[PDB]
Amino acid sequence: LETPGDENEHAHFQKAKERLEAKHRERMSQVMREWEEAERQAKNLPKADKKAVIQHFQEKVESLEQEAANERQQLVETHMARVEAMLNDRRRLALENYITALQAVPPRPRHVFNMLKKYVRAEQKDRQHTLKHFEHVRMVDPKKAAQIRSQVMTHLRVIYERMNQSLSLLYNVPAVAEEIQ
Amino acid sequence: LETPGDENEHAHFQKAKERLEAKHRERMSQVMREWEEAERQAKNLPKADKKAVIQHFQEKVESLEQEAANERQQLVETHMARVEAMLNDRRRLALENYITALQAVPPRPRHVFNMLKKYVRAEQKDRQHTLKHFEHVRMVDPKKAAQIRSQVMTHLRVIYERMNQSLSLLYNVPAVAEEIQ
Ligand SMILES: [Os+3]
Ligand SMILES: [Os+3]
Numbered sequence: 001l002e003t004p005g006d007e008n009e010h011a012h013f014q015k016a017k018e019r020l021e022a023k024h025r026e027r028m029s030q031v032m033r034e035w036e037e038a039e040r041q042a043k044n045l046p047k048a049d050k051k052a053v054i055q056h057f058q059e060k061v062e063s064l065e066q067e068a069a070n071e072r073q074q075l076v077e078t079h080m081a082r083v084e085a086m087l088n089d090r091r092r093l094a095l096e097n098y099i100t101a102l103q104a105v106p107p108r109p110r111h112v113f114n115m116l117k118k119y120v121r122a123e124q125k126d127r128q129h130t131l132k133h134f135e136h137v138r139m140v141d142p143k144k145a146a147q148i149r150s151q152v153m154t155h156l157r158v159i160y161e162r163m164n165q166s167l168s169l170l171y172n173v174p175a176v177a178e179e180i181q
Numbered sequence: 182l183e184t185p186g187d188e189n190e191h192a193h194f195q196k197a198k199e200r201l202e203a204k205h206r207e208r209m210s211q212v213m214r215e216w217e218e219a220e221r222q223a224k225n226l227p228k229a230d231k232k233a234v235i236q237h238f239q240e241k242v243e244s245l246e247q248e249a250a251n252e253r254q255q256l257v258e259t260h261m262a263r264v265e266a267m268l269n270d271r272r273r274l275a276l277e278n279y280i281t282a283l284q285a286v287p288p289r290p291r292h293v294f295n296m297l298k299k300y301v302r303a304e305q306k307d308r309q310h311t312l313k314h315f316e317h318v319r320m321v322d323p324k325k326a327a328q329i330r331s332q333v334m335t336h337l338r339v340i341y342e343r344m345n346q347s348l349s350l351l352y353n354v355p356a357v358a359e360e361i362q
Contacts (some may be wrong), residue, residue, distance in 0.1 A: 069320065
């Protein structure tokens, strides 16, 4: 995670969640094994002791379940972070590329557009992505999402303003205006 | 979901979440499209109206995000339900199969055990599965999990009692006792 090179991320990301899982079960089952033995003694001990063993290990697992939590979030935040940089970086590019329009003999009307749908579908990936991500916050931590709606509302609005502000660049190139539209 | 036959479930399950996703984005983007147009009018209207349009669609999306929620849970509960029946059904079987031991000439010491690890690893799938499932409740709806810990604690305990109570059937067959152990 702190190094990784194989381009495709879902690959890696999947692999990290994967081994994150092959790791917890390991430490977790060790407790379900330390617990079983544990009770195997409070078997002929007071019922008060039986009870404390239960409450002790009942807490060790919460401990672990917590570690893993954090541990897992730490993974996600990265992905998201890595995902967004891709998404922004691509977008920015298609801008110049779609900016490179298709100026020459017949302004490659098929390229302009070919290029356009890149920007568009791209910028949609943003919107589509910004949204998914949020739903998560809506569920998992309803309060967390409350705070962050004002924040993310602004974002979506930016894309909208941008997108149209992009299409509105045809208001600088008349030929392909009615031509492509 | 109400019919399905292709054995493997993860397959289907994946497919259902899949189309559940190809469906929401559809209805969702329609709102992000009904919203954009909407604001495009409150553009020269009072700032009070601009504000209501915002608050109206801000609520239509919560609506949808809610539908989808429910809609998605409805999927999960099935899977879990289908998953558990597999898990129980298999287990029960390995019991008789592992019960079928390996009685004959040399009580297929390699079969008894071969059979055993089926039961075991099986019953672990239970424990492993019961646990995963719960972590979900711990996160998503912390309160939900609080209620249900007493319930699921009992379960895990049952497997434990069972498992050992199974191995302890060798206390009925002496040959393979020291023989396999
Ligand atoms: Os995400
Ligand atoms: Os599950």
